[PDB]
Amino acid sequence: GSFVPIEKLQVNGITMADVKKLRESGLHTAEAVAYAPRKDLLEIKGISEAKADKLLNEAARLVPMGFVTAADFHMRRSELICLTTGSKNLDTLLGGGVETGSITELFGEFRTGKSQLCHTLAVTCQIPLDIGGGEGKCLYIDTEGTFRPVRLVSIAQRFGLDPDDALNNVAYARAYNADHQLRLLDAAAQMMSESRFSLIVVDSVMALYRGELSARQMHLAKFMRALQRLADQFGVAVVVTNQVNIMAYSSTTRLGFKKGKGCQRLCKVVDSPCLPEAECVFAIYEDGVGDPR
Numbered sequence: 001g002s003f004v005p006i007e008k009l010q011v012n013g014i015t016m017a018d019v020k021k022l023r024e025s026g027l028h029t030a031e032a033v034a035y036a037p038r039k040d041l042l043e044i045k046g047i048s049e050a051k052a053d054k055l056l057n058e059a060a061r062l063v064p065m066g067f068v069t070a071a072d073f074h075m076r077r078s079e080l081i082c083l084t085t086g087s088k089n090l091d092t093l094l095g096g097g098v099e100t101g102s103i104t105e106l107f108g109e110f111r112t113g114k115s116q117l118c119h120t121l122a123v124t125c126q127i128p129l130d131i132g133g134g135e136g137k138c139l140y141i142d143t144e145g146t147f148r149p150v151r152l153v154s155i156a157q158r159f160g161l162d163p164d165d166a167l168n169n170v171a172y173a174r175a176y177n178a179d180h181q182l183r184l185l186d187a188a189a190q191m192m193s194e195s196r197f198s199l200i201v202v203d204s205v206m207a208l209y210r211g212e213l214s215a216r217q218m219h220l221a222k223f224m225r226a227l228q229r230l231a232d233q234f235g236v237a238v239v240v241t242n243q244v245n246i247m248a249y250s251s252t253t254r255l256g257f258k259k260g261k262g263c264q265r266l267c268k269v270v271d272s273p274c275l276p277e278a279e280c281v282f283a284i285y286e287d288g289v290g291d292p293r
């Protein structure tokens with residue numbers, strides 16, 4: 001578990017009925033309750049101002065909300081799960097792999113390995129922590145109708161998983177428009193509180209554009225917040241592709257992809273608040289992302 005069950009707040013007066021309203025308002029985790037703005041709670045038909053306090057205080061008991069030393073914070077970060085990309089080179093570039101808790105943006109032109117990396121991740125997020133996995137399910141939001149379950153079979157076997165189980169562990173959803181894409185997230189909160197997910201994939205967030213450009217950006221920004229909110233509330237890793245700034249601001253780790261020779265691909269760290277601006281070379285294989293021969 002990478003988040004505190006909201007049911008743990010049903011004490012000292014908090015009822016199942018109270019939590020029921022919280023869930024209904026979209027809070028399915030203690031962290032969610034802990035990170036919710038007081039105003040949001042108060043505007044919930046049924047929650048008293050004195051009750052909101054009860055909730056906040058209780059949640060704050062289960063979820064850290066105070067100060068700690070930068071030294072301590074460093075330690076905690078070093079404990080974050082980093083999902084393996086399947087490539088030693090790439091994992092090294094990312095200081096271990098895809099960092100859970102924030103958004104990693106995969107950008108570049110079509111056929112640069114972005115989608116392939118997502119297919120691999122959809123599987124490695126399911127494997128044992130001991131081997132760079134997240135022992136959790138994957139929420140896969142596809143806006144281009146390019147996801148292909150069959151590609152995951154070969155990948156699962158490569159990691160010793162039973163293909164049937166691997167495909168069963170991926171909650172797939174095709175989004176047809178921005179409002180739909182955003183609507184899918186609300187349902188994801190519910191699912192994630194019912195089964196352990198370790199990763200959310202959105203290929204690609206830029207579909208958000210298909211005079212009113214300002215409206216597009218405002219929608220894109222709202223979607224990215226929702227994604228980061230889910231990362232905070234459930235402690236999962238989030239990867240988003242971007243076919244080719246709201247993205248530079250929202251994304252934590254931004255990786256640029258270019259096509260290399262043959263099945264080889266290049267990946268450069270474009271933005272990161274802690275990773276050095278370096279680049280590596282990885283490859284694409286019938287059984288997922290790996291390192292060059």
Ligand SMILES: [Cl-]
Binds near residue numbers: 074077274
């Ligand atoms: Cl750090």
Ligand SMILES: [Cl-]
Binds near residue numbers: 116
């Ligand atoms: Cl490719």
Ligand SMILES: [Cl-]
Binds near residue numbers: 112116
């Ligand atoms: Cl790609």
